[PDB]
Amino acid sequence: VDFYYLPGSSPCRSVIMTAKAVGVELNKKLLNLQAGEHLKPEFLKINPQHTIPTLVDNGFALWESRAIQVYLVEKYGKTDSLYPKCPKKRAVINQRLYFDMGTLYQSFANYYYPQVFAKAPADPEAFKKIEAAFEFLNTFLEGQDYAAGDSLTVADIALVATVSTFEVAKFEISKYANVNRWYENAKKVTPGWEENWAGCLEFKKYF
Amino acid sequence: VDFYYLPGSSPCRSVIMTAKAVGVELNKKLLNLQAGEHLKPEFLKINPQHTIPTLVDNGFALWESRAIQVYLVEKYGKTDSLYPKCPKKRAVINQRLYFDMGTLYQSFANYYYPQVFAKAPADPEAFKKIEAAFEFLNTFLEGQDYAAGDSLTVADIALVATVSTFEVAKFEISKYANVNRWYENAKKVTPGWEENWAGCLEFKKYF
Numbered sequence: 194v195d196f197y198y199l200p201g202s203s204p205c206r207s208v209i210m211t212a213k214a215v216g217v218e219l220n221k222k223l224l225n226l227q228a229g230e231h232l233k234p235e236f237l238k239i240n241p242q243h244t245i246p247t248l249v250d251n252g253f254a255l256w257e258s259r260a261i262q263v264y265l266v267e268k269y270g271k272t273d274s275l276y277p278k279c280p281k282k283r284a285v286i287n288q289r290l291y292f293d294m295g296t297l298y299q300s301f302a303n304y305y306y307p308q309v310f311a312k313a314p315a316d317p318e319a320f321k322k323i324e325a326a327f328e329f330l331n332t333f334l335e336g337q338d339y340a341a342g343d344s345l346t347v348a349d350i351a352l353v354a355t356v357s358t359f360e361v362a363k364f365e366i367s368k369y370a371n372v373n374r375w376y377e378n379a380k381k382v383t384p385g386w387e388e389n390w391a392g393c394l395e396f397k398k399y400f
Numbered sequence: 401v402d403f404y405y406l407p408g409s410s411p412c413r414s415v416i417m418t419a420k421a422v423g424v425e426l427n428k429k430l431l432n433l434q435a436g437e438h439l440k441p442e443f444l445k446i447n448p449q450h451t452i453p454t455l456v457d458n459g460f461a462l463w464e465s466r467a468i469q470v471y472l473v474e475k476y477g478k479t480d481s482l483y484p485k486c487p488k489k490r491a492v493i494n495q496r497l498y499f500d501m502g503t504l505y506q507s508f509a510n511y512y513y514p515q516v517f518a519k520a521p522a523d524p525e526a527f528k529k530i531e532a533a534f535e536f537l538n539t540f541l542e543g544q545d546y547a548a549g550d551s552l553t554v555a556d557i558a559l560v561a562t563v564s565t566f567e568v569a570k571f572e573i574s575k576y577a578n579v580n581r582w583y584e585n586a587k588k589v590t591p592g593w594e595e596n597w598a599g600c601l602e603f604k605k606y607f
């Protein structure tokens with residue numbers, strides 16, 4: 194199973210943690226975006242969208258981190274606890290995965306990427322979207338130890354990658370008590386946490 | 401099955417078409433965002449994120465359109481053709497669903513929403529992101545009649561909602577030959593197309 198990635202990338206880290214949780218060995222292939230390695234014909238043949246993470250598993254090329262997470266659980270999970278069979282349980286997880294992409298990580302990208310990638314001054318209105326997203330996550334976690342069910346799921350793992358990126362970016366997570374509680378627990382229970390944190394510190398080099 | 405929605409909303413329309421495709425009757429409940437009906441305590445108790453679409457199915461409150469689509473197929477589908485059992489088939493569909501959210505519809509929102517909702521002048525750099533997203537979709541559709549498998553899936557239905565919103569916004573879809581071919585076919589085969597198009601024309605009132 195080939196895995197095209199960089200350690201600093203949040204969506205890559207979500208896959209790293211998920212693979213560790215299911216116990217599937219990845220052939221980790223660094224793909225140097227700053228050198229344009231993802232833009233060369235050899236990579237475009239695998240993933241025409243030229244994004245990381247990309248998985249190539251026995252002929253199957255797959256991208257979108259959250260799709261990769263679910264596929265790894267379905268194929269390699271000795272049990273389905275990270276992504277249970279029940280459609281209702283799956284639906285809550287799926288909702289959280291879309292929240293992670295379209296609300297929470299999107300707010301990260303919209304606020305920090307113009308600063309670190311375009312050298313633009315911080316946009317205080319974009320900052321308010323981060324606050325709104327954390328407020329929602331805080332509500333989702335009211336009375337809950339995990340984000341999308343009774344136990345750790347791929348939704349938690351995706352959210353850990355995102356929230357740890359916020360942590361290294363110096364966002365004050367402590368303001369959101371349920372998020373902080375969930376997050377500090379997640380560090381202790383989530384497979385691959387240490388590797389995720391190493392990657393967050395690599396990402397930090399952009400600040 | 402309660403369905404909180406507005407006809408003009410693209411993510412709502414994806415659910416409308418999916419429900420028609422699986423043959424599940426929805427109790428359609430208009431939720432007037434301009435009146436703040438989604439912000440009142442009675443709705444926040446159902447969906448604290450105060451978004452449409454929201455489904456309430458026998459006690460289960462669910463939001464995120466693409467999560468709702470999959471849940472409706474899993475629960476009500478007499479067959480699984482719209483979201484097959486095979487994890488590999490599911491993974492491609494899931495990838496496309498994330499593409500629809502995070503690449504294609506995101507490019508719609510980033511370009512048109514500031515214009516129609518904030519009265520800002522058009523941003524030509526944001527326009528280039530739409531072009532990039534259509535280019536990718538055009539490549540995905542090379543040699544393919546459907547977006548994510550041999551037959552119509554929930555990925556096609558989500559993409560139809562998005563691309564029809566582009567159509568009513570006067571984006572020139574014809575420039576992307578595979579997209580245009582796929583889209584014109586999708587109109588003829590996708591359950592609920594007419595209702596989707598009515599909603600696109602309602603959305604058009606914002607232009």
Ligand SMILES: N[C@@H](CCC(=O)N[C@@H](CS)C(=O)NCC(=O)O)C(=O)O
Nearest residue numbers: 202204243244245246257258259502
């Ligand atoms: N929605 C994606 C995002 C992937 C993504 O944007 N990756 C970035 C790096 S963090 C990338 O490959 N950028 C290079 C490019 O798009 O050309 C996922 O969850 O996998």
Ligand SMILES: N[C@@H](CCC(=O)N[C@@H](CS)C(=O)NCC(=O)O)C(=O)O
Nearest residue numbers: 295409411450451452453464465466
């Ligand atoms: N990612 C979502 C987006 C839902 C969404 O943003 N809906 C808009 C209307 S098109 C909304 O409810 N806005 C009101 C709000 O967020 O307060 C989904 O696919 O369902």
